[PDB]
Amino acid sequence: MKARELDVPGAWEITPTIHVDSRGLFFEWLTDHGFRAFAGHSLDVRQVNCSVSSAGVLRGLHFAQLPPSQAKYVTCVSGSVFDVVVDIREGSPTFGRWDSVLLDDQDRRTIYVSEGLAHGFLALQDNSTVMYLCSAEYNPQREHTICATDPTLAVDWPLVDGAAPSLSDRDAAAPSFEDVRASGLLPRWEQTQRFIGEMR
Amino acid sequence: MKARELDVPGAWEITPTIHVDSRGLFFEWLTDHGFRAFAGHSLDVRQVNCSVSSAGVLRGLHFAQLPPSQAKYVTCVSGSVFDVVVDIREGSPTFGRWDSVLLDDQDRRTIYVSEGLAHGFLALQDNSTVMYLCSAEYNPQREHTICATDPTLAVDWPLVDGAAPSLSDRDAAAPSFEDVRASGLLPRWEQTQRFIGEMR
């Protein structure tokens, strides 16, 4: 299982080894040995979520406060989504930068988003199903959103032929990256790096 | 999340609460609190597998030796499969009995199969995708198969319009339930119950 670190350190694109046969195909989405190899520790799966999205739906950008924050291991099992990770860790060398992975049912990649990072996606097709393993259960009291179209982050979302994204009400009213930063709610690089080190 | 114990004790059918909105739908597939409620302990996810199957493919019947065996939390995210669990635990009150759950992308149910049970499924539609969380990594040296069409177990598979199942080569040559039993490879109820108790 090929794992490539993204331009945001602590986020990875994983490409599975897909076994194809007369019955269809099989692959190992996660393995503890494969995960540990790139992440340096085991993924503690406390929750697994699934969404189905129509074309142009944008969910994000979410993060969870440290600790324990909420690491995400994210894949698309039908359709396709353009998935984004944002370095929101203050003091990080790449603070403010983002990168993307194309998740879909063709190459069946995954994005791993480690703790204190922000994540979201835009569904590129109808009936786009995303599953994601989380290192913590849903905790609306420590989960935050950043406007997915925030001009400081300036993520380049690939609009669908060629229309405005559909967002939830909460995601549509999300505060700006600068609002969140100035609220002292962004994770700190020093502590996220240390928290990941104590797991390793 | 509604959890109903099957006729095989230690296997459960889980029905999620599906949240539907303008974007599509979302649900929590697993939560630690929801899992613990019915299973009495946390699921230790060490591997997650995914298959895509065409109509009439039958995978099974697999089990893993205790300990730690391999508990499975199994769902269908596209298409539909008829999923079977078999009580292969010697000394169990329901030794030899089986039950089924219909997994599909409509009701989005799950089957939880605890340790020392045997599991399999028959895909009822093309492009039937199954994901499953496992409490242990793939260990071909402690994993065994029982003929899915074994006459002692006598599972009633729902053949697809109306043809023989397609099996892997290994599953097509699997030994009989009585071969496995007589090889002392079946799990023991007393130890599986005790192993689950030490986790609880």
Binding residues of B for substrate: 23, 28, 47-49, 59, 72, 119, 143, 170
How many Å apart are CA A61 and CA A185, to the nearest integer?
14
Q: Which residues pair with A20 in a beta bridge?
A: A25
Tell me, rounded to whole angstroms, the distance of Cα B162 from its chain centroid.
Answer: 24
How many Å apart are CA B178 and CA B176, to the nearest integer?
5
CB contact A54 to B (< 8 Å) = yes
Q: Which residues pair with A24 in a beta bridge?
A: A21, B53
Give the three-class secondary structure for B193: helix
The one-character DSSP state at A175 is: P
CB contact A163 to B (< 8 Å) = no
Experimental technique used to determine this entry = X-ray
Q: What DSSP string runs through B120-131?
A: EEEE-STTEEEE
Main-chain phi, psi angles of B105, to 5 degrees: -90, 10
Give the list of residues 6+ apart from residue B30 with CB closer than 8 angstroms, or none: A45, A47, A48, B43, B73, B110, B133
Look up residue A156 and give its two tokens. 């380049």
Asked if B79 and B73 touch (Cβ cutoff 8 Å), the reply is: no
Burial class (CB in 10 A: 0-12, 13-18, 19+), B54: middle
Positions of A marked active-site: 62, 132
Asked if A35 and A72 touch (Cβ cutoff 8 Å), the reply is: no
3-state secondary structure A55-79: CCEEEEEEEECCCCCCCEEEEEEEC
Query: Which residue type, as a one-letter code, is found at position A75?
Result: T
Look up residue B39 and give its two tokens. 């299973």
How many Å apart are CA B49 and CA B72, to the nearest integer?
10
Tell me, rounded to whole angstroms, the distance of Cα A144 from its chain centroid.
Answer: 14
Class of domain A1-200: mainly beta
Mutate to test the interface with A, among B1, B23, B76, B133 (most CBs of A within 10 A): B23
Domain locations in chain B as residue ranges: 1-200
Give the list of residues 6+ apart from residue A172 with CB closer than 8 angstroms, or none: none
Give the list of residues 6+ apart from residue B109 with CB closer than 8 angstroms, or none: B13, B14, B15, B16, B75, B76, B101, B102, B103
Length of chain B, please? Answer: 200
CB contact B15 to A (< 8 Å) = no
Q: What DSSP string runs through B26-43?
A: EEEEEEHHHHHHHHSS--
Rg from Cα positions in chain B: 16
Q: Which residue has the tokens 């049912």?
A: A105
Look up residue A42 and give its two tokens. 């085991």
Burial class (CB in 10 A: 0-12, 13-18, 19+), A52: buried
